[PDB]
Design a protein around this ligand. Structure first.
Ligand SMILES: NC(=O)c1ccc[n+]([C@@H]2O[C@H](COP(=O)([O-])OP(=O)(O)OC[C@H]3O[C@@H](n4cnc5c(N)ncnc54)[C@H](OP(=O)(O)O)[C@@H]3O)[C@@H](O)[C@H]2O)c1
Ligand SMILES: NC(=O)c1ccc[n+]([C@@H]2O[C@H](COP(=O)([O-])OP(=O)(O)OC[C@H]3O[C@@H](n4cnc5c(N)ncnc54)[C@H](OP(=O)(O)O)[C@@H]3O)[C@@H](O)[C@H]2O)c1
Ligand SMILES: C[C@@H]1CN(c2ccc(F)cc2C(F)(F)F)CCN1S(=O)(=O)c1ccc(C(N)=O)cc1Cl
Ligand SMILES: C[C@@H]1CN(c2ccc(F)cc2C(F)(F)F)CCN1S(=O)(=O)c1ccc(C(N)=O)cc1Cl
Lengths: 261, 260
């Protein structure tokens, strides 16, 4: 990690992809990234909402802003979106995996279809994008940024499929970080553990069932960008203070030393 | 609190029961006088296991062969097994897709197969079995690993699938508490075990102390009989000590009333 204080200029001229960027934290990240003079390529499914975002980005001072629309249910699209984004920017420094299949609050009864879709979109596609991007990311000694959640560190009811997929990201990407450590690949992996953030999709899905405070999505977004710029292993963000301090697991840090050899 | 008589006449399914810990588990069940239905892809080996379970004092022993890459087989395998045994008390999810030790190298197929077999089939099996278990106030036992709790290199796809199990099955465990479904869920976090397949995979690259699979198998069954939420089993007691996660227990307890 960059033993250093975050500077907005760290992101100037940086060639950055942001997925699920048509709303919520994805949008806000893209805007922040634009104000810092980044080249931004964004994706999502709705081209309409995507274009609007691209408008707002160019004004803000984005060195370049582009969009590509498609669904990450389709892995062939996943792959091509990254090569195409590479084109539009002339390389890739930071890859921001953020999109998720749309979810709500339910007791799991029989939806094996929602479980697979969550696994494919929330997780597998992240792996596809990662493979697509790794080449460019090695040359630029860039960064992968992976947005996760409290539900991907601890267990909560009514978010089973979602939690499995976030847990799966932890498992896969943490495991990959260590491989890059051994094989000396200089590409940072940052896992971001977000508590409730006030996106319009979250507050819609939380209404009635859950009473808890939502942290701003604007600071949430900056915080994720900083964690990746500074190449941290993990980032925690949550309105509370209780929360953010327990997330770190030193005993885990301890056992991961058994391999060291 | 545990005593072998707990599993006498209990109806039990063991998956991946043709080799390693799965075979050992079926054998313990047989001694204990359980009704057992076992599975794997190979009928030849399942046959050998079934006759052995009988010699060991099994109240009943039968195999059903098929691949858990097929969610239709998985889902019918449970219907068929349950109807055979007249019900079901315990479901022991244990099988995995063939895995070896290598650096992730763009092999997305392996990552997906691992999610399919290691994680998703466990869910289909569970859905299929839930009505019978609700009826018997039975139990689901999920066999996981250290890589399902912590990050290691050379096991990326595998860890992903096992982490998946923890996040999914712990989440549903909370759900049953609250919807008063009396079906226990046990996650078993096992370090290295001396199964032929583990031993062939983990060498001669490195090697730590392998605990014995007969012990492991039994601790898994015990964990399940006693309805515990997690079971840890490793060669080193220092390792077992470090597996537990109190911060998590608190974050889940805190946000327990958070609310409804
Ligand atoms: N906000 C929170 O309370 C909270 C809490 C914990 C974790 N997180 C994490 O934060 C991240 C963003 O959350 P959010 O609430 O901001 O998300 P969101 O508002 O629901 O939107 C995420 C984006 O993903 C896109 N998307 C949906 N399906 C897609 C698909 N099949 N292929 C490609 N893109 C797709 C959506 O755009 P389209 O509909 O146009 O496709 C959307 O822009 C997620 O990774 C989430 O897990 C958020
Ligand atoms: N042994 C260890 O060092 C270790 C460490 C940590 C965790 N674990 C956990 O312990 C459990 C058992 O491990 P193990 O070492 O005992 O495994 P194993 O003996 O090598 O084999 C597991 C079983 O799964 C079956 N199987 C393979 N592919 C299948 C498929 N596609 N569909 C249905 N069944 C299939 C195999 O039978 P067929 O080939 O005939 O299909 C076999 O009976 C696993 O969940 C593993 O994650 C083991
Ligand atoms: C309920 C929220 C938002 N959610 C989310 C995000 C984006 C969406 F689009 C939809 C959702 C969801 F709510 F429907 F799941 C994902 C899951 N979580 S979370 O991990 O941020 C979380 C935070 C705090 C607590 C707590 N009780 O302290 C519990 C949880 Cl699960
Ligand atoms: C290597 C073993 C056995 N393995 C396994 C089991 C059954 C199989 F069939 C195949 C494998 C595998 F090794 F090939 F993945 C699954 C993964 N693990 S483990 O999680 O028990 C483990 C134990 C100790 C260390 C450590 N070095 O401190 C690391 C790990 Cl990942």
């Amino acid at each position: 990690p960059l033993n250093e204080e975050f500077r907005p200029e760290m992101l100037q001229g940086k060639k950055v992809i942001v997925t699920g960027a048509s709303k919520g934290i994805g949008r806000e990240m893209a805007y922040h990234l634009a104000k810092m003079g980044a080249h931004v390529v964004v994706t999502a499914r709705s081209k309409e909402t995507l274009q609007k975002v691209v408008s707002h980005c160019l004004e803000l001072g984005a060195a370049s802003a582009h969009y590509i629309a498609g669904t990450m249910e389709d892995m062939t699209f996943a792959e091509q979106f990254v090569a195409q984004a590479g084109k539009l920017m002339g390389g890739l420094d930071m890859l921001i995996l953020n999109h998720i299949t749309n979810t709500s609050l339910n007791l799991f009864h029989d939806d094996i279809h929602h479980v697979r879709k969550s696994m494919e979109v929330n997780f597998l596609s992240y792996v596809v994008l990662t493979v697509a991007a790794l080449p460019m990311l090695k040359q630029s000694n860039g960064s992968i940024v992976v947005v996760s959640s409290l539900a991907g560190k601890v267990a909560y009811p009514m978010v089973a499929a979602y939690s499995a997929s976030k847990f799966a990201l932890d498992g896969f990407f943490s495991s990959i970080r260590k491989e890059y450590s051994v094989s000396r690949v200089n590409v940072s992996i940052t896992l971001c553990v977000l508590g409730l953030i006030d996106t319009e999709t979250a507050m819609k899905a939380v209404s009635g069932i859950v009473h808890m405070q939502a942290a701003p999505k604007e600071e949430c977004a900056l915080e994720i960008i900083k964690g990746g710029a500074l190449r941290q292993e993990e980032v925690y963000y949550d309105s509370s203070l209780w929360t953010t301090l327990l997330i770190r697991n030193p005993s885990r840090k301890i056992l991961e030393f058994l391999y060291s050899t």
